[PDB]
Amino acid sequence: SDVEKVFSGFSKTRENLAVIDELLLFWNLAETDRVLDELEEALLVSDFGPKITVRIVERLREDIMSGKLKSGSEIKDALKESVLEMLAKKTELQLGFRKPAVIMIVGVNGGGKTTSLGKLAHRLKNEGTKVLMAAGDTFRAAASDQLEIWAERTGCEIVVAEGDKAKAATVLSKAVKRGKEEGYDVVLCDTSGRLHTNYSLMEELIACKKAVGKIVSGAPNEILLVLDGNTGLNMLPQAREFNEVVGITGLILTKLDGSARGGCVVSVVEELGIPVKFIGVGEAVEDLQPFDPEAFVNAIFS
Ligand SMILES: [Mg+2]
């Protein structure tokens, strides 16, 4: 079920990568170079970036020439293993034991940042976690309102901004101070949503993590970057930017339901070394799924 969510999320990627099975029917030692040329094309087509594609393909070539892989089916399994190792190389939320844990959620418009926060709150509440929401998306009035609805839905308290021109850092500080005083397990912090990254946005995010750190030592525990999965490889420059400016601990890739760009998941993880912790594969609250690298590899290749 949970597992079969992901099978649908990447159904189109799986259909497209299936051409690899057909190609491998015609593999033999002599045909290795031509077969690998075609495998390379298929990976690129599904948004495996140039860097990982060459890495995967050349490792297969080596292992074929060395005699480690002696059949099409062995080659296909080595392909799956090579991808799994690029992925899994922790995807769970690392909240520790000190209370409160602090989670910031960041990302640009269209990525489902505020919505994912709501769905995460719903998930945490399910496991019996005491959650305070903090509406630090001060740029988007509609986000703050949406979050209040989410707070009502999930049964969380929410700290909201006073006014249309509140400082996010101020709202977050107030939230974490309160979470600490009132014995909350987790403070879930939203942050400002913009059309695209810019100097103001990053300055703002830096100010935010600095303020929460002032109140609780080590905060935030997690800074999760939410990305529209449909942007494929075009997400990498942006994730790279968030990471070197702010310091991201986990990715959430959304809107993935039905995608043909499954390769980008592997590409973004291996390039930046940040784990994908959740994937959004639907509009339902329970369509925010923790990421399972093995099931993903099976979903796109099998
Ligand atoms: Mg700094």
Q: Ligand 1 mean position to 187 CA, how many Å?
A: 22
- Cα(103) to ligand 1 centroid in Å equals 18
Structure-block tokens of residue 241: 């930017």
| Type of residue found at 131 | V
Alpha carbon of 217 to ligand 1 centroid (Å): 16
Distance 220 CA to ligand 1 centre (A): 14
**Span from the CA of 28 to the centroid of ligand 1 (angstroms):** 55
Which two three-digit tokens encode residue 219? 């905060």
Q: How far is the CA of 209 from the centre of ligand 1 (A)?
A: 9
Radius of gyration of the chain (CA): 21
First to last CA, the chain: 17
Q: How far is the CA of 138 from the centre of ligand 1 (A)?
A: 21
For the chain, count helices (H), then strands (E).
13, 8
The rounded Å distance from CA 291 to ligand 1 centre is 30
Question: What are the tokens at 218?
Answer: 């080590």
Is residue 279 a contact partner of residue 254, using CB atoms and an 8 Å limit? Answer: yes
**257 CA from centroid of ligand 1 (Å):** 36
CB of 177 closer than 8 Å to CB of 106: no
Question: How many angstroms does the Cα of residue 218 sit away from the middle of ligand 1?
Answer: 14
Q: How was this structure determined?
A: X-ray
Q: Which of 250, 159, 236 is nearest to 197 (CA)?
A: 236
Domains and CATH numbers, the chain: 1-91 (1.20.120.140), 92-302 (3.40.50.300)
Ligand 1 mean position, distance from CA 250 (Å): 19
Longest dimension (CA), the chain: 71
Distance 247 CA to ligand 1 centre (A): 9
Task: Using alpha carbons, list the distances in angstroms from residue 298 to 8, 41, 77, 99, 119.
Answer: 12, 20, 11, 37, 25
Contact 277, 251 (CB under 8 A): yes
Residues making up the annotated binding site for GTP are 107-114, 190-194, 254-257
Element (H, E) at 52: helix 50-65
Q: How far is the CA of 241 from the centre of ligand 1 (A)?
A: 14
Ligand 1 mean position to 206 CA, how many Å?
Answer: 6
Beta bridge partners of 158: 133
Amino acid at residue number 198: N
Binding residue positions: 107-114, 190-194, 254-257
* Strands 222-228 and 276-280, sheet pairing: unpaired
Distance between CA 146 and CA 213 in Å, rounded?
26
Tell how far CA 134 is from the center of its chain: 21
